Design a binder for these strands. Structure first.
Lengths: 177, 75, 55, 116, 136, 50
RNA sequence: UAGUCCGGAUUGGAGUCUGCAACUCGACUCCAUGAAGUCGGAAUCGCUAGUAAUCGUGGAUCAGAAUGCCACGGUGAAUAC
RNA sequence: UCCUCCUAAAGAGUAACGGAGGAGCACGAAGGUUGGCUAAUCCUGGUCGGACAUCAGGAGGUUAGUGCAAUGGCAUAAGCCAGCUUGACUGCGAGCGUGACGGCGCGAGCAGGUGCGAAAGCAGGUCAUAGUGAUCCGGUGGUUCUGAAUGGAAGGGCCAUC
RNA sequence: ACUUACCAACCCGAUGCAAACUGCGAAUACCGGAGAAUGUUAUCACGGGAGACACACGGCGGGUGCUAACGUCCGUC
RNA sequence: GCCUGGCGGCCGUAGCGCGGUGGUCCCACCUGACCCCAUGCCGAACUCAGAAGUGAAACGCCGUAGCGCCGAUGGUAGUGUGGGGUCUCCCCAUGCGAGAGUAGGGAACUGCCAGGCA
RNA sequence: UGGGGUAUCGCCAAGCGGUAAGGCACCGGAUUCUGAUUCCGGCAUUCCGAGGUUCGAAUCCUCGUACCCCAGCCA
């Protein structure tokens, strides 16, 4: 709720100032933050996907939803309805708390941190990034890791254009190399 | 390599428009719901449409998809 | 949220070497020691020493 | 679309009740009102209607759009419907879950004598 | 020789060749070789006639073959009885009716189009005529 | 084909049985179905996946 | 008792000396890196006593360049029916 | 032998050693009901991650799906997911369709008992059309219906069934 | 990373073909209802007796054949 | 009379797209969620308690024909009956008569009930 | 022309739809004055070509190619 209050005064005010909106509700707001961990090496092992699920359970504060295969493809030796990833849809209060931990303490603990790419918008403002280690979150115990498992974050927001998402995210200072 | 066909199933419209029916009479023995059930018409398990009340057969075209209903006018 | 299927997500206090005492909710279940925060991380000095190579 | 999803949830029971030919009590829940109207078996003409936008109902309520308001509306539709000779209807929940204040409205219509 | 790359069924019924044609105006080019007789045209006759045209008006010009075979004709071998299945697909014909512009040509004078269309109409089995591109 | 024939016998004292077919290989468990018993005239539990 | 405080190859940086001149193409030093290798398949070699084994030192050639060659000593076996 | 399309001439039917394909099952959930949901494919962004495994957004519109061929159907979904379940009931059945017949099919409703649903209601298997075999002879369970003097029994019948 | 007489998806414009293609769609035929005239009930049901179940050509619609056959297989007259 | 909401008739002359406008009420987004209830994670949806804020999105209304859609008249194709030929195809008398295309029409029309404004 | 069979390392020959096994050869080392024999190590065919079913093809289906076997008759 720290960055939610910071949103409600200074990001709403700041973006009403920058872009010449009329409505106070036309301003972009971040809808949700989805944390995917598409493990894929669970074609042979179930405890590996269980450990992946424990890691997203630690990084967010929620149980993950173990996702199944939509189509069967033979390129990767999977089958229809076989469990192959896990995700957490963070929204509401926990979106802002995770977003605070993310841009505050998790992003600086990235190895060789140069900055987050500004051209990682999908055309509709929705950011998506990938971390390569789960170690960069302070909850994951470094002595209890077995496999290095990155994950991909996706900030989904209500902006129409992607420069409008540059503005929204950049008003949280959200590093942007 | 050929030379086979099934026995002809005798589908189609058994009672036409304006034709007086008893209750229970089969109107259209058919295969999907080419014709849908309307007022006082039932649809059997093999999509056979049968007269559920007495009257006269009424073929109509209803609804947003231009479906072909079959009503029965009470008569 | 549902009942107890989720991990215990209790408010803790993180503190780094920058003097940034910051209380947050995290499901570690333990108070935290850090080094780098968003305040006083070598991001801009890092970009400067990155560009500053040639000659 | 939320409204269109609701209408396609409604449609099966709507067409089934038009097929049986029963007078239906159509409910309609909005975030600050509930609407209830008794509709003839031809589907075109209404008979009885009460809702929280009527000041006869709205003045005696704290807030239109909660379970007390909906119970008031169900009582009103049952009273007016019994005054106009209608006894036995079929409840068209109109795409909402029979849970919250549509359950309060329909229970209130069953207490006050309307047969379904 | 022209033949569809990939059919849907290998053997077609005979059927009949009645009525008039659909391709009737000189559409693409400027001069046209239009059918008058009914008949049908194998792929060898279309190829023969096209070589007569392409030779005749040399590698200048531009020629459109407006008909395409797409109809398989089956024959039974020699000393085979009747019955015992349908024959085998030997060639492919196009069915022609009176009015089909069989070929078009553009980028030549009219007198060479007369000449190539004479040269190539003597490789076809149907009575044929010369047409021009009429404007509406 | 592979799918065998079994008798669902009645749990009441009657000898009345329904009859049906079971895949014996994939479902080796017995089959209990509360069916209708017309001698008792009542819905009784039926057993005996043969 | 660990590929480890074994092993030092390889490589980056910084140097000293000789020599007109160390890029091809020296030697040595300092910091960093830290491979392969855990006793070697078929096969094969040397040694009978101050010997083998092992440890250092010197010299010739040479401005500078030896793990080679030629010498010198220290410790010092086993076994031969 | 059976199913689907065409031939087949816009009702039905219609032949050939005519053109093309399939069946001789599966399922105790893949059936019943209630509540909900909506595909293929492509584009963009994104850790390993790749033309194609997961995530997010957009275009798109059912080009998808339907346990298995093809045709006709399907959004109110007949498609997809979950809760509870056994109506994959028993006796009948107005009326029809379809066959030379044997036979086959559709069926509102009535009675008894049941499931789901708050209720209206829906449920006598599955989206439909294939998944099959008359009679005799005989096997197993039930029912005194018969039971060659009489009481039983044997055998026979009837119902279920192999 | 730099050039290119070669091919080409999708999309758009224009042109054809289809028994097993259809966002269209006749004539006819068929089913049902009413009405007039005409017809030796021509109609239906039930009962006695059959015969026949090798068809042929000709028109029209087709399959097969080579739009061959006084060919073959259907539909209808 | 104008506007809005519900349930229908009708099923593209009714749908799309582009542009403008609406919020007093209504509607929608919204605010919050410990409770009723819910998520194979998540109050996103469902649900509940509300009403601060905005009509941005949505939805409605008003324009606009770029498209979809409707669509004559005439001619053409086909075809029933009778006749004819040069007869694998056509012609004549006669009855029916398209599909496509053209001119054009065209951004709906309407019933019941309820509420707000005049 | 029909029916059947085969095509897999340089050669002969095994392969079960989720991996390519054997022998001879070849390559390197060793033994030997040198070669043969011998001994120690290796490698190795993405499976005749094209299309399709499948998540996946050497494997299953269809077509083409090349080579074998059987039949191609009564008059």
């Amino acid at each position: 709720a720290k960055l939610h209050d910071y949103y409600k005064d200074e990001v709403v005010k700041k973006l009403m100032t920058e872009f010449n909106y009329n409505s106070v509700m036309q301003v972009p707001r971040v809808e949700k933050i989805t944390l995917n961990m598409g493990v894929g090496e669970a074609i042979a092992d179930k405890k590996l996907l269980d450990n992946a699920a424990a890691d997203l359970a630690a990084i967010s504060g929620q149980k993950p939803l173990i996702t199944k295969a939509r189509k069967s493809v033979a390129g990767f030796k999977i089958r229809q309805g076989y469990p192959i990833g896990c995700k957490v849809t963070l929204r509401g209060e926990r979106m802002w708390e995770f977003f605070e931990r993310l841009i505050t303490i998790a992003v600086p603990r990235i190895r060789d941190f140069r900055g987050l790419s500004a051209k990682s918008f999908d055309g509709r403002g929705n950011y998506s990034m990938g971390v390569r280690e789960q170690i960069i979150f302070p909850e994951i115990d470094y002595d209890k890791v077995d496999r290095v498992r990155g994950l991909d974050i996706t900030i989904t927001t209500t902006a129409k254009s992607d420069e409008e998402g540059r503005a929204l995210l950049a008003a949280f200072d959200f590093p942007f190399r | 390599r050929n030379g086979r066909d099934s026995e002809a199933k005798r589908l189609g419209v058994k009672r036409f428009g304006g034709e007086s029916v008893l209750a229970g009479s089969i109107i259209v023995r058919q295969r999907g719901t080419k014709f849908h059930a309307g007022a006082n018409v039932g649809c059997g398990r093999d999509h056979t449409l049968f007269a559920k009340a007495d009257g006269k057969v009424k073929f109509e075209v209803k609804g947003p998809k231009n479906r072909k209903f079959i009503s029965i006018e009470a008569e | 949220m549902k009942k107890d299927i989720h991990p215990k997500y209790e408010e803790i206090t993180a503190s780094c070497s920058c003097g940034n005492v910051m209380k947050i909710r995290s499901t570690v279940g333990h108070d935290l020691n850090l080094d780098v925060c968003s305040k006083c991380h070598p991001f801009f000095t890092g970009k400067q020493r990155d560009v500053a190579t040639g000659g | 679309d939320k409204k269109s999803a609701r209408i396609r949830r409604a449609t099966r029971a709507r067409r089934k009740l038009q097929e049986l030919g029963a007078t239906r009590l159509v409910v309609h829940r909005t975030p600050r009102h509930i609407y209830a109207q008794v509709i003839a078996p031809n589907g075109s003409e209404v008979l009885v209607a009460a809702s929280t936008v009527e000041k006869a109902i709205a003045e005696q309520l704290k807030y239109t759009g909660n379970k007390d308001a909906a119970a008031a509306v169900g009582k009103a539709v049952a009273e007016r419907a019994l005054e106009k000779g209608i006894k036995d209807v079929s409840f068209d929940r109109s795409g909402f879950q029979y849970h919250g204040r549509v359950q309060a409205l329909a229970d209130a219509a069953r207490e006050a004598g309307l047969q379904f | 020789m022209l033949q569809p790359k990939r059919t849907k069924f290998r053997k077609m019924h005979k059927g009949r060749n009645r009525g008039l044609a659909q391709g009737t105006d000189v559409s693409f080019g400027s001069f046209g070789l239009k059918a008058v007789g009914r008949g049908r045209l194998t792929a060898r006759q279309i190829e023969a006639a096209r070589r007569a045209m392409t030779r005749a008006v040399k590698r200048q010009g531009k020629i459109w073959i407006r008909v395409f075979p797409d109809k398989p004709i089956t024959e039974k071998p020699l000393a085979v009885r009747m019955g015992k299945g349908k024959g085998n697909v030997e060639y492919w014909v196009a069915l022609i009716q009176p009015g089909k512009v069989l070929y078009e040509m553009d980028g030549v004078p009219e007198e060479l189009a007369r000449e190539a269309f004479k040269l190539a109409a003597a490789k076809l089995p149907i009575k044929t005529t010369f047409v021009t591109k009429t404007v509406m | 084909g592979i799918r065998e024939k079994i008798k669902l016998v009645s749990s009441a004292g009657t000898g009345h049985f329904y009859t049906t077919t079971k895949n014996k290989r994939t479902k080796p468990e017995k089959l209990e179905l509360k069916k209708f018993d017309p001698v008792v005239r009542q819905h009784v539990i039926y057993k005996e996946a043969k």
